[PDB]
Amino acid sequence: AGAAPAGGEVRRVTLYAERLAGGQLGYGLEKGKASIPGPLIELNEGDTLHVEFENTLDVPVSLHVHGLDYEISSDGTKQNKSHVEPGGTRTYTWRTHEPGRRADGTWRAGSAGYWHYHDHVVGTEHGTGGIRNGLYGPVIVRRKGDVLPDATHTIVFNDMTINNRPAHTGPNFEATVGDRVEIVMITHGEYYHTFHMHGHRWADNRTGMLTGPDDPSQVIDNKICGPADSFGFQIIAGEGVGAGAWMYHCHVQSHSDMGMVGLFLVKKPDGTIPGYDPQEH
Amino acid sequence: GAAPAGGEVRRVTLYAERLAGGQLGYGLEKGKASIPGPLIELNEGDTLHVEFENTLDVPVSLHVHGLDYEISSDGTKQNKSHVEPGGTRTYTWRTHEPGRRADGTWRAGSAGYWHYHDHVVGTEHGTGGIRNGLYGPVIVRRKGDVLPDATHTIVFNDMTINNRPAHTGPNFEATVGDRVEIVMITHGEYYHTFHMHGHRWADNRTGMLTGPDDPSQVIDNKICGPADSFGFQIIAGEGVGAGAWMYHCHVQSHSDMGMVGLFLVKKPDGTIPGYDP
Amino acid sequence: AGAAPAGGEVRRVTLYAERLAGGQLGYGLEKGKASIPGPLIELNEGDTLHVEFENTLDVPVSLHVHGLDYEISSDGTKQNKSHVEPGGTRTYTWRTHEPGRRADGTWRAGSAGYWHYHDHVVGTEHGTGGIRNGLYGPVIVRRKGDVLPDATHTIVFNDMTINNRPAHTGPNFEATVGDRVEIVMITHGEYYHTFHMHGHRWADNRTGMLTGPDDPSQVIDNKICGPADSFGFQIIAGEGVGAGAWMYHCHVQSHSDMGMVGLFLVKKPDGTIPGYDP
Ligand SMILES: [Cu+2]
Ligand SMILES: [Cu+2]
Ligand SMILES: [Cu+2]
Ligand SMILES: [Cu+2]
Ligand SMILES: [Cu+2]
Ligand SMILES: [Cu+2]
Ligand SMILES: [Cu+2]
Ligand SMILES: [Cu+2]
Ligand SMILES: [Cu+2]
């Protein structure tokens, strides 16, 4: 368990929007390495990120982010002329801030949390065609002293798919018992969902962990979520429950029946998962 | 500045009337009904007697979330507190401060972002009333709560915002640095997700973190369903500047079909950069 | 009526899946006595429960629980070979733990909460047919020092029904002004809902009560919920509002109109309910 540092760096990254195989659309850090979800962008509170965005598609595309600070010119919307023409580039600037006491004595909430970025202009002026086809990704903004995980996995319920995968194709993720595993969970599209994990639970607060015995946050294993909700958490793999093929699914019953399921495959230290037979899943 | 302790007995006249295009609304005076209805504001301890007159050709009622009331003011047919056409009735709403009970447990106060609506037009759950515009906000403040420079009410009623036509806002104006309060209420049949560009708030009572030990989540996108009510204050343009900041339901077809408005945050000189209407 | 003690007991119960009238299915503490929702199970953090389960149905059934600790062999899924053949029995073991600091120094959340159990194999391998027909029930896990209620009532929004009852049949629940009344609220199926109570409000946190003036938890009377969500709370009946037939309902408008409504009948001490006639 590492700790996030205080932020304040100016960082740059290149991002591209590209057609994938099978007619999907994705963001990536380098040409031909686009993915759904898009790449995970990580920052510490006070960091600034300059996203040099290139649009390789034949229609306008944009980049809009939740949670973080930006000026209207990096809104990523047609309304504010912040979309990128076919073949074009544009640098979007995202800023983040620490919490702190205002002059009026109130508390400014910081930028930290589990956030996301997505297209705002493909298909419609709300990015509906862009989101449908894969133009979304995760952003984590860490607070000084936050617990850092061994692994981070992103699970996007996009309409009736997980990460735009075909029905009943996961994804699955692997850990060893004792691993500190971070989930980022984002929802998109038209439908509400409930995200559930067998054998694991978390706090419904920013970090998904109680800060201590005086934290009143709720502890849950089932979370309602709708389009553009983003939350996250860290769990200790197999804590109190051990190894196995631990299902996660949307708990709306027809949704689980129609493919919104995957596996958190928690292994013993020797690499084994007793009983696990993929033919039975 | 800050809300005082409450404990005044307040009285107000409210009327239900027909508005243009067959809508129905609450107002403080005859001819002044609005959708949403007028904002009622109280401090915990306060009492409010609402002298309600029904000018419609159908029974109408007044039902309130969150506040204390006796059965004879629940605004239902069940407890005979609906108002016949042409009739009058006084509804009594009370509110209380928090404090410790004798068993050691803490009684929560009335404070919050609440709402009132009809419970008898169309059905005995007010379905047709609510659909037609018979709803409005009620804020109950706790002693010491920060007061805003302005309050705006946003209601997602089925696929409309404030019963308005698709893609007609409302828009709400503020100047950079203003302390702006939003009351956000949901009604009808559908779930929604309320999102604002450029701004975020805490998912707790006041929408602001009480300080560095407040573990309330900070969000920009909030799932809501029928009769949910929440609120928050944000500093307009804080860390982001002036501009036309969209807010919208984030369910995709809803935003596409017109559940979208603008939070127009002005520079001090009153202009809005980049804002081509 | 008291406070929860610290747990750490090994307990056992017997539970049966059986048919009920009309093709409903339920769990029961004894054969013949299945109910929908199933029997309330209550534990104190640290307790272990061995559930000695029998399937009296003609199709496989299972028992799966939210929140509690269980090893993979007690998953209650076909996928991990934890289901029960027709006429079969199996012991499912559920454990619970206290909050405390982990080895890595962070705070481990305890098992306490308002949880639930349900079938995961009837109709589909997510229990869709089981849940639909009534194979679900409440579990409460208490934290040492939690205040205990005078009564506990469970309300489940299962698709468009409450507790799989016919439309417009409540249920109704009775108390006396001043009673400490505990509500367990579970949702299943296909629909989101908003649970609303006239005359009463509760905190959107574990217990439904604020810890004290420093507890930032929201105070609400209207709670969005979806399939497999579970929350609970304790209210003082008629507190600041008095006696009467206090309505509770889903606030999604067509749902209340189509019969997801009941009454919280709060009696005066003489046992009467002002303004209410059957
Ligand atoms: Cu947007
Ligand atoms: Cu789903
Ligand atoms: Cu968005
Ligand atoms: Cu009602
Ligand atoms: Cu919507
Ligand atoms: Cu209501
Ligand atoms: Cu499951
Ligand atoms: Cu409902
Ligand atoms: Cu479940």
* DSSP symbols for B23-89: -EEEESSTT--BSSPPPEEEETT-EEEEEEEE-SSS-B--EESSSB--GGGS--TTTT--B-TT-EE
Amino acid identity of B84?
Answer: E
The answer to whether residues C124 and C83 touch, using CB atoms and an 8 Å cutoff, is: no
CB proximity A191 to C under 8 Å: no
Closest CA to C166 of C261, C277, C253: C261
What pairs with residue C186 in β-bridges? C156, C230
Distance CA B264, CA B258 (A): 17
Q: Is the dihedral of CA A269, A270, A276, A281 positive or negative?
A: positive
CB proximity A209 to C under 8 Å: yes
Known binding residues of A for Cu(2+) are 64, 66, 118, 120, 193, 196, 198, 249-251, 255
Beta-strand pair C161-162/C219-220? unpaired
Distance CA A118, CA B250 (A): 12
Distance CA C65, CA C74 (A): 9
- Nearest-Cα distance to chain C for A216, in Å, is 7
The ligand minimizing its distance to the Cα of A224 is 2
CB proximity C213 to B under 8 Å: yes
* A278: three-class secondary structure by DSSP: helix
Closest CA to B12 of B36, B41, B35, B34: B41
Binding residue per annotation — C64?
yes
Structural determination approach: X-ray
Report, in angstroms and rounded to the nearest whole number, the Rg of chain C calculated over CA atoms. Answer: 19
Closest CA to C219 of B204, B102, B74, B115: B204
CA dist C68 → A201, C75, C94, C140 (Å): 9, 11, 6, 10
What pairs with residue A222 in β-bridges? A196
Asked if residue B170 has a cis previous peptide bond (ω within 30° of 0), the answer is yes
CA dist A53 → A35, A93, C199 (Å): 15, 10, 54
C-alpha distance across the termini of chain A, in Å:
33
Give Cβ neighbours of residue C222 (< 8 Å, ≥ 6 apart): B65, B227, B228, B229, C194, C195, C196, C251
Sheet holding A10-19, edge to edge: A25-28, A10-19, A48-55, A89-95
Sheet holding A180-188, edge to edge: A161-162, A151-158, A180-188, A230-236
Contacts of C274 in chain B (CB under 8 A): 71
Give Cβ neighbours of residue B61 (< 8 Å, ≥ 6 apart): B75, B76, B77, B81, B82, B83, B118, B119, B120, B126, B129
Closest CA to A251 of C112, C96, C66: C66
Closest CA to C207 of C199, C195, C215, C197: C215
User: Would you state the CATH architecture of domain C1-146?
Assistant: Sandwich (2.60)
Other Cβ atoms less than 10 A from the Cβ of C33: the count is 12
- The answer to whether the CB atoms of A69 and B221 lie below 8 A apart is no
Structure tokens at B68: 């204390």
The answer to whether residues B276 and A154 touch, using CB atoms and an 8 Å cutoff, is: no
C-alpha distance across the termini of chain C, in Å:
31
> What CATH code is assigned to C147-278?
2.60.40.420
- The answer to whether the CB atoms of C106 and A147 lie below 8 A apart is yes
The answer to whether residues B92 and B46 touch, using CB atoms and an 8 Å cutoff, is: no
- Nearest-Cα distance to chain B for C127, in Å, is 25
- The answer to whether the CB atoms of A216 and B217 lie below 8 A apart is no
Closest CA to A198 of B130, B169, C65: C65
Distance CA A4, CA B88 (A): 63
Resolution stated for this PDB structure, in Å: 1.8
Distance CA C264, CA C181 (A): 10
Distance CA C66, CA C138 (A): 10
Closest CA to B222 of B234, B236, B207: B207
Contacts of C249 in chain B (CB under 8 A): 125
The answer to whether residues C221 and B68 touch, using CB atoms and an 8 Å cutoff, is: no
The answer to whether residues C138 and C182 touch, using CB atoms and an 8 Å cutoff, is: no
> What CATH code is assigned to B1-145?
2.60.40.420
Closest CA to A173 of A157, A200, A153: A153
Return the CATH superfamily for domain A147-281.
Answer: Cupredoxins -  blue copper proteins (2.60.40.420)
Closest CA to B29 of A246, C265, B37: B37
Structure tokens at B277: 């209407």
Q: Is B59 exposed, middle or buried (0-12, 13-18, 19+ CB in 10 A)?
A: middle
Beta strands in A103-206 (DSSP E): 107-108, 113-118, 136-142, 151-158, 161-162, 173-176, 180-188, 193-197, 202-203
Contacts of C224 in chain B (CB under 8 A): 191, 223-225, 228
The answer to whether residues B30 and B41 touch, using CB atoms and an 8 Å cutoff, is: no
Tell me the CA–centroid distance for residue B99 and ligand 1, in Å: 42
- Nearest-Cα distance to chain A for C272, in Å, is 38
Give Cβ neighbours of residue C154 (< 8 Å, ≥ 6 apart): C37, C40, C137, C138, C163, C183, C184, C185, C186
Beta-strand pair C64-65/C113-118? antiparallel
- The answer to whether the CB atoms of C219 and B112 lie below 8 A apart is yes
Distance CA A124, CA A80 (A): 15
Structure tokens at C59: 């199709």
What does DSSP assign to residue A206? S
Where residue C8 falls (left for φ over 0; alpha for ψ -120 to 50; beta otherwise) is left
Helix ranges (H only) for chain B are 127-132, 252-256
What pairs with residue C196 in β-bridges? C222, C249
CATH of B146-277, one of 3.20.20.80, 2.60.40.420, 2.40.110.10, 3.40.50.1360: 2.60.40.420
CA dist B195 → A66, A231, B254 (Å): 9, 15, 12
Distance CA C25, CA C27 (A): 7
What pairs with residue B151 in β-bridges? B181
Domain ranges of chain C: 1-146, 147-278
What does DSSP assign to residue C74? G
Residues comprising chain B, all counted: 277
Of A202, A247, A257, the CB nearest to C77: A247
Give Cβ neighbours of residue B32 (< 8 Å, ≥ 6 apart): none
Chain B, 215-234: which have a CB under 8 Å from a chain A CB? 215-221, 223
Q: What are phi and psi of C194, to 5 degrees?
A: -130, 120
What pairs with residue C263 in β-bridges? C247
Closest CA to B84 of B119, B62, B57, B118: B57
